[PDB]
Design an enzyme around this catalytic site. Sequence first.
Site, PDB file in Angstrom:
ATOM      1  N   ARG A 195      -6.263   7.273 -11.318  1.00  0.00           N
ATOM      2  CA  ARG A 195      -6.123   8.134 -12.489  1.00  0.00           C
ATOM      3  C   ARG A 195      -6.813   9.495 -12.450  1.00  0.00           C
ATOM      4  NH1 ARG A 195      -7.622   4.457 -17.348  1.00  0.00           N
ATOM      5  NH2 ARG A 195      -8.538   3.114 -15.716  1.00  0.00           N
ATOM      6  N   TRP A 250       1.018   7.832  -4.352  1.00  0.00           N
ATOM      7  CA  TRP A 250       0.874   7.539  -2.933  1.00  0.00           C
ATOM      8  C   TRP A 250       0.030   6.279  -2.783  1.00  0.00           C
ATOM      9  CZ3 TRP A 250      -0.752  12.423  -4.804  1.00  0.00           C
ATOM     10  CH2 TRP A 250      -2.116  12.527  -5.104  1.00  0.00           C
ATOM     11  N   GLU A 295      -3.247  -1.796  -0.468  1.00  0.00           N
ATOM     12  CA  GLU A 295      -2.012  -2.296  -1.060  1.00  0.00           C
ATOM     13  C   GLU A 295      -1.077  -2.824   0.025  1.00  0.00           C
ATOM     14  OE1 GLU A 295      -0.485  -0.072  -4.723  1.00  0.00           O
ATOM     15  OE2 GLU A 295      -1.491   1.556  -3.621  1.00  0.00           O
TER      16      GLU A 295
HETATM   17  C1  HEM Z   1      -1.331   9.135  -7.222  1.00  0.00           C
HETATM   18  C2  HEM Z   1      -1.813   8.104  -6.516  1.00  0.00           C
HETATM   19  C3  HEM Z   1      -1.982   6.706  -7.152  1.00  0.00           C
HETATM   20  C4  HEM Z   1      -2.755   5.753  -6.621  1.00  0.00           C
HETATM   21  C5  HEM Z   1      -3.608   5.877  -5.330  1.00  0.00           C
HETATM   22  C6  HEM Z   1      -2.672   4.594  -7.484  1.00  0.00           C
HETATM   23  C7  HEM Z   1      -3.317   3.407  -7.272  1.00  0.00           C
HETATM   24  C8  HEM Z   1      -3.022   2.256  -7.960  1.00  0.00           C
HETATM   25  C9  HEM Z   1      -3.287   0.918  -7.498  1.00  0.00           C
HETATM   26  C10 HEM Z   1      -3.936   0.590  -6.140  1.00  0.00           C
HETATM   27  C11 HEM Z   1      -2.880   0.070  -8.451  1.00  0.00           C
HETATM   28  C12 HEM Z   1      -2.956  -1.466  -8.383  1.00  0.00           C
HETATM   29  C13 HEM Z   1      -1.572  -1.922  -7.942  1.00  0.00           C
HETATM   30  C14 HEM Z   1      -1.497  -3.379  -7.604  1.00  0.00           C
HETATM   31  O1  HEM Z   1      -2.517  -3.928  -7.115  1.00  0.00           O
HETATM   32  O2  HEM Z   1      -0.400  -3.969  -7.811  1.00  0.00           O
HETATM   33  C15 HEM Z   1      -2.313   0.840  -9.555  1.00  0.00           C
HETATM   34  C16 HEM Z   1      -1.791   0.362 -10.746  1.00  0.00           C
HETATM   35  C17 HEM Z   1      -1.105   1.084 -11.705  1.00  0.00           C
HETATM   36  N1  HEM Z   1      -0.776   2.440 -11.668  1.00  0.00           N
HETATM   37 FE1  HEM Z   1      -1.585   3.751 -10.294  1.00  0.00          FE
HETATM   38  N2  HEM Z   1      -1.814   4.865  -8.555  1.00  0.00           N
HETATM   39  C18 HEM Z   1      -1.356   6.176  -8.371  1.00  0.00           C
HETATM   40  C19 HEM Z   1      -0.448   6.827  -9.193  1.00  0.00           C
HETATM   41  C20 HEM Z   1       0.096   6.373 -10.374  1.00  0.00           C
HETATM   42  C21 HEM Z   1       1.067   7.056 -11.217  1.00  0.00           C
HETATM   43  C22 HEM Z   1       1.733   8.424 -10.881  1.00  0.00           C
HETATM   44  C23 HEM Z   1       1.310   6.279 -12.286  1.00  0.00           C
HETATM   45  C24 HEM Z   1       2.241   6.548 -13.496  1.00  0.00           C
HETATM   46  C25 HEM Z   1       2.720   7.766 -13.821  1.00  0.00           C
HETATM   47  C26 HEM Z   1       0.481   5.093 -12.169  1.00  0.00           C
HETATM   48  C27 HEM Z   1       0.420   4.063 -13.078  1.00  0.00           C
HETATM   49  C28 HEM Z   1      -0.070   2.815 -12.815  1.00  0.00           C
HETATM   50  C29 HEM Z   1       0.089   1.671 -13.684  1.00  0.00           C
HETATM   51  C30 HEM Z   1       0.803   1.599 -15.058  1.00  0.00           C
HETATM   52  C31 HEM Z   1      -0.601   0.534 -12.945  1.00  0.00           C
HETATM   53  C32 HEM Z   1      -0.734  -0.914 -13.448  1.00  0.00           C
HETATM   54  C33 HEM Z   1       0.476  -1.723 -13.007  1.00  0.00           C
HETATM   55  C34 HEM Z   1       0.318  -3.083 -13.634  1.00  0.00           C
HETATM   56  O3  HEM Z   1      -0.300  -3.179 -14.736  1.00  0.00           O
HETATM   57  O4  HEM Z   1       0.816  -4.080 -13.035  1.00  0.00           O
HETATM   58  N3  HEM Z   1      -0.236   5.184 -10.994  1.00  0.00           N
HETATM   59  N4  HEM Z   1      -2.435   2.166  -9.211  1.00  0.00           N
HETATM   60  C1  M85 Z   2       2.840  -7.234  -8.405  1.00  0.00           C
HETATM   61  N1  M85 Z   2       1.842  -6.991  -9.462  1.00  0.00           N
HETATM   62  C2  M85 Z   2       2.500  -7.022 -10.779  1.00  0.00           C
HETATM   63  C3  M85 Z   2       3.190  -5.700 -11.038  1.00  0.00           C
HETATM   64  C4  M85 Z   2       4.393  -5.669 -11.745  1.00  0.00           C
HETATM   65  C5  M85 Z   2       5.042  -4.462 -11.991  1.00  0.00           C
HETATM   66  C6  M85 Z   2       4.476  -3.282 -11.520  1.00  0.00           C
HETATM   67  C7  M85 Z   2       3.275  -3.305 -10.804  1.00  0.00           C
HETATM   68  O1  M85 Z   2       2.738  -2.124 -10.357  1.00  0.00           O
HETATM   69  C8  M85 Z   2       1.716  -2.050  -9.367  1.00  0.00           C
HETATM   70  C9  M85 Z   2       1.537  -0.574  -9.106  1.00  0.00           C
HETATM   71  C10 M85 Z   2       1.880   0.350 -10.093  1.00  0.00           C
HETATM   72  C11 M85 Z   2       1.743   1.717  -9.869  1.00  0.00           C
HETATM   73  C12 M85 Z   2       1.255   2.157  -8.648  1.00  0.00           C
HETATM   74  C13 M85 Z   2       1.110   3.516  -8.392  1.00  0.00           C
HETATM   75  C14 M85 Z   2       0.623   3.917  -7.144  1.00  0.00           C
HETATM   76  C15 M85 Z   2       0.270   2.964  -6.183  1.00  0.00           C
HETATM   77  N2  M85 Z   2      -0.228   3.328  -4.962  1.00  0.00           N
HETATM   78  N3  M85 Z   2       0.439   1.656  -6.463  1.00  0.00           N
HETATM   79  C16 M85 Z   2       0.916   1.237  -7.657  1.00  0.00           C
HETATM   80  C17 M85 Z   2       1.065  -0.124  -7.881  1.00  0.00           C
HETATM   81  C18 M85 Z   2       2.628  -4.516 -10.563  1.00  0.00           C
END
Ligand code: HEM
Ligand code: M85
Lengths: 407, 411
Positions: free
Chosen positions: B111, B280, B285
């Site tokens: 974030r 990215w 991951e």
């Molecule tokens: C820019 C580089 C970004 C990195 C390095 C990053 C990193 C991550 C990681 C490592 C997770 C955990 C994912 C998992 O373990 O499944 C995550 C979750 C999440 N990301 Fe980010 N992210 C990025 C960009 C974004 C963007 C652009 C958005 C939305 C506009 C976003 C929204 C979210 C949301 C909503 C989750 C939670 C998904 C869930 O609740 O299952 N991310 N992010």
């Molecule tokens: C498999 N975990 C449950 C689940 C369900 C639906 C979406 C999701 O999102 C993970 C997620 C979401 C946003 C991301 C943005 C960037 C990133 N590098 N990984 C990201 C990984 C995760």
Amino acid sequence: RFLKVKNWETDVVLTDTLHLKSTLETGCTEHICMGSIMLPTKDQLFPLAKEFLDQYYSSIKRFGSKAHMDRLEEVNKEIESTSTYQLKDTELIYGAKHAWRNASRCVGRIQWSKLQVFDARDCTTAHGMFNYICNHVKYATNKGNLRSAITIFPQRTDGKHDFRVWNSQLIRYAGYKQPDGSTLGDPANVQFTEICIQQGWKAPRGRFDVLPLLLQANGNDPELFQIPPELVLEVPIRHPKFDWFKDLGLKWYGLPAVSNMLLEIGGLEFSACPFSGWYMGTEIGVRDYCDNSRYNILEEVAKKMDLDMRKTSSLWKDQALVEINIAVLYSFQSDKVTIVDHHSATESFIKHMENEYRCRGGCPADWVWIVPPMSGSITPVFHQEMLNYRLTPSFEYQPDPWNTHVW
Amino acid sequence: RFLKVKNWETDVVLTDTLHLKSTLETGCTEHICMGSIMLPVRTKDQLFPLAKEFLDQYYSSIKRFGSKAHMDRLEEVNKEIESTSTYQLKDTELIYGAKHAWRNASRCVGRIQWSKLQVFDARDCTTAHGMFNYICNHVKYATNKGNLRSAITIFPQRTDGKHDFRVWNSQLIRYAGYKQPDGSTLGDPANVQFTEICIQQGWKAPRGRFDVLPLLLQANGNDPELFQIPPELVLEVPIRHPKFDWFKDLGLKWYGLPAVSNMLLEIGGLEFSACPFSGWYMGTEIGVRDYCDNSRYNILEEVAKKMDLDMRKTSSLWKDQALVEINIAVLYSFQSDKVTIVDHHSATESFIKHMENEYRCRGGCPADWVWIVPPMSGSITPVFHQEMLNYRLTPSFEYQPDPWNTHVWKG
Ligand code: HEM
Ligand SMILES: CNCc1cccc(OCc2ccc3ccc(N)nc3c2)c1
Ligand code: HEM
Ligand SMILES: CNCc1cccc(OCc2ccc3ccc(N)nc3c2)c1
Ligand SMILES: C[C@H](O)[C@H](O)[C@H]1CNc2nc(N)[nH]c(=O)c2N1
Ligand SMILES: C[C@H](O)[C@H](O)[C@H]1CNc2nc(N)[nH]c(=O)c2N1
Ligand SMILES: [Zn+2]
């Protein structure tokens, strides 16, 4: 009201009803979760006693028996008269085992029913406490074949005659601040290492000095006692591949024995109740050795491995962390001292969880603490949903004595 | 009410006031914590205050709260609601909304980047072919030849719930998974069910180890349609190890662009059921979860064998050892090919700065420790020692059920 927990690696779904019997508070609300926060009279007493005796007598299949009714009668008498009551040995043992069974942060609970309980409620002095503590250490250590144990000192009466072990663990290494600026020995123990010295202890100011015991009986001033070195089992740390590892000059003790917690049973409070089991490898190698505010030797080890410590993206810290933890385990195993790796322990915990859901209707578990501090997702507990709630009997935190003691 | 969080490594204490702005429920109570639970058609009735609360937020952010522009907009929305039963967001509001949904995503460690998000307005879209075009442009823009750029594309909002836009894929780019009759799996096990649907819908599967899945796209509540992403748009990276030459012979590769496409974007009571977004990768991951999860490619053993580790007792930590080298190879490959990636040390270090900045400028930062702490080497990252408060703010990204379980089929 009936809650379901899913394991995402296996799809196994368990149903929890045990949480409905929960009584104490989590710190969370429906507007905010506090799961990662580390630390969130006569009329009060009888319902608490009643609750406990209810579960005790249910556990021995005499719920609604004359013995149950009589005991309840007797305890109520004692309460109205004395403003407290005394646990029978059977009830004390039950209560201690269940405090462990209920410890939502403990990954080692598959062992909960095999706890050796030592009743030290007849203790009156610090020399007395010392004797009991020495006996505990010798028994628990068992020359390396470790056995779980707890020693229970007299219960709180009115907060003025408290028994307290001032050490956080029975066995810990000293920590000294330098004029040079850094820290010699264990940084977590700097404040306590100083209070011992501020009290008369003579420190060998070495890297790994076993701290003296500081024991408070009946509310009096605490006294220093040295644990007989032959009772303190230590393990020199070497690697089964790196011959230069031995040269690092590290060792650790075999017995983790937590001594600052409060044991609550049936409304009664045991302020001094040191307990011990055996180590999971990562407590020492990951947390004790590699934490920044502890022994913090990651850099040192990486150098001798000649890793590219230039960019974090070489993951040199990750590489060193692993070798270290390999060494810790190798060392204890070689020396026939009980230790468990984080893979075996978490696998055991999943099995214990499934047992408890089966035979009890649930198992309170704190994910934030159950998941190990390295290689989290390759252990089965990572993918396991857990419900956290507080059951009694319980182990609780209590304030450090030096902040409270009417000196 | 004020709340304190402590970093146990630095003793830095922060104070949260932002949690007071929280409305939505957590799942937790005073007697239970559901902190580790993964997953814990709207009337003009409740739409009014949801819109008003968003518009109050929006006009505060641009320092025009209580202005004539603010008040007129409120009246305009209120009239549109009681007349048409919903309302339309201005472009400015949409952009603010998407950025704040990300800013509010308590499970996201990335974030610090929230204010740099390219918002593509696809609300004039009407058909699946049109969805395909917008998604192609998103992927091309986001990829940027390896120099990844964060982006989101937003399709028309929900109306009666019967005309939903949905991307059926969980991510825009993912590999197929095939269950073999002998019980084993070819490709990515996580994608087996989706692969089946595609095949049923008419996709001709090459049935290989790394087949990029087709897009299955649903516009205006119609049956979804299949599209193949042009391969030249799909940036992929061969995985090798910097010291181990045998690693390339494992035959692994991964795609460059993580682009999540199954979430729901909520802004001011409006629901955007199709809103694919991309950033990215954090190396773990791919290296920890995608390659080393037992329920995914699960290559730990094969790697451990080739390293000639003691695989007889877990206490040798052969699994931990193989896991690190796989993650080293992932980071090495992406950097060598100049494809944007971040290791978990850099990412968590940046998250801490972000969080501290947020506490100061905003009064708080909702954060879900269970998800913020990375899946390997947890305690040697600074987030492990950071206390965090989890609560829900809107605008937000929400989960929604998989479309194949709710879709009314037309034919
Ligand atoms: C820019 C580089 C970004 C990195 C390095 C990053 C990193 C991550 C990681 C490592 C997770 C955990 C994912 C998992 O373990 O499944 C995550 C979750 C999440 N990301 Fe980010 N992210 C990025 C960009 C974004 C963007 C652009 C958005 C939305 C506009 C976003 C929204 C979210 C949301 C909503 C989750 C939670 C998904 C869930 O609740 O299952 N991310 N992010
Ligand atoms: C498999 N975990 C449950 C689940 C369900 C639906 C979406 C999701 O999102 C993970 C997620 C979401 C946003 C991301 C943005 C960037 C990133 N590098 N990984 C990201 C990984 C995760
Ligand atoms: C026998 C082998 C045991 C193992 C392998 C084990 C394992 C662990 C571990 C790894 C932790 C986390 C510790 C930390 O990170 O600081 C923990 C916490 C805890 N253990 Fe166990 N344990 C064992 C025995 C016991 C016994 C015998 C008791 C009590 C009778 C006990 C009670 C507790 C309690 C109360 C906590 C959490 C304390 C807190 O709330 O901070 N454990 N255990
Ligand atoms: C430093 N962490 C906070 C804190 C404060 C007080 C006690 C405590 O307990 C940790 C603990 C407790 C019981 C244990 C039993 C066995 C074991 N191997 N480790 C164990 C570790 C932890
Ligand atoms: C049961 C548990 O909530 C689940 O396995 C979570 C744990 N933490 C996670 N953390 C991240 N970043 N991603 C995940 O998928 C998960 N899975
Ligand atoms: C901030 C966080 O609550 C703190 O670092 C916790 C996290 N998880 C932990 N888990 C275990 N087993 N032991 C700990 O001391 C901690 N510390
Ligand atoms: Zn909670």
